[PDB]
Design a protein around this nucleic acid. Structure first.
Ligand SMILES: [K+]
Ligand SMILES: [K+]
Ligand SMILES: [K+]
Ligand SMILES: [K+]
Length: 178
DNA sequence: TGTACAATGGG
């Protein structure tokens, strides 16, 4: 270990979610995107933009800030313009901005939870022409993809689905080595 | 446009 001892130490803190926690969050995230859809529908902005803005706002309340493989930013002006157009929106909407806020907050917490998983899985793949942290970034990137596509009402534990994407991720990764 | 038993020190 090195300056990544710091990372592991950062994540080892975050306690695992119980099942009911997992669900409630996953509901919030799902509901968040649904809102963000209605919002993209009214303000005719990109759905992925709107989120990205909302996320960069509530990223303040996050338990982990510098997460490998995840995508930072974006830009304070667009944040500013977009949020401007958003907050200034009508009052009957309002509710939707709250939900969208909650969802993205959820997603952040969810991902924070599962960072320990990515690391445990990642260990399995050392010695394949990626340095540890590479794995961790690819790992995290899969985990983010995982949360994106996860449907909770399938009654499967998150770790199962997450594991699949975390492995798909690192596997495709080392395949792009050739 | 679909990817799913659980898995978060390991076995
Ligand atoms: K022991
Ligand atoms: K022991
Ligand atoms: K033991
Ligand atoms: K044991």
């Amino acid at each position: 270990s090195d300056p990544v001892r710091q990372y592991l130490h950062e994540i080892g803190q975050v306690p695992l979610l119980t099942l009911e926690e997992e669900i409630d969050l996953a509901r919030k995230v799902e509901e968040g995107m649904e809102a963000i859809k209605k919002l993209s529908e009214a303000t005719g902005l990109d759905q992925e933009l709107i989120r990205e803005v909302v996320r960069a706002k509530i990223l303040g309340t996050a338990r982990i800030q510098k997460i490998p493989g995840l995508k930072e930013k974006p830009d304070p002006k667009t944040v500013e313009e977009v949020d401007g157009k958003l907050k200034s929106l009508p009052k009957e909407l309002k509710r939707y901005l709250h939900i969208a806020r909650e969802g993205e907050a959820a997603r952040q917490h969810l991902i924070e939870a599962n960072l320990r998983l990515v690391v445990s899985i990642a260990k399995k793949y050392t010695g394949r022409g990626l340095s540890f942290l590479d794995l961790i970034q690819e790992g995290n990137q899969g985990l983010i993809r995982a949360v994106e596509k996860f449907e909770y009402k399938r009654r499967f534990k998150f770790s199962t689905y997450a594991t699949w994407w975390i492995r798909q991720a690192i596997n495709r990764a080392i395949a792009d080595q050739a």
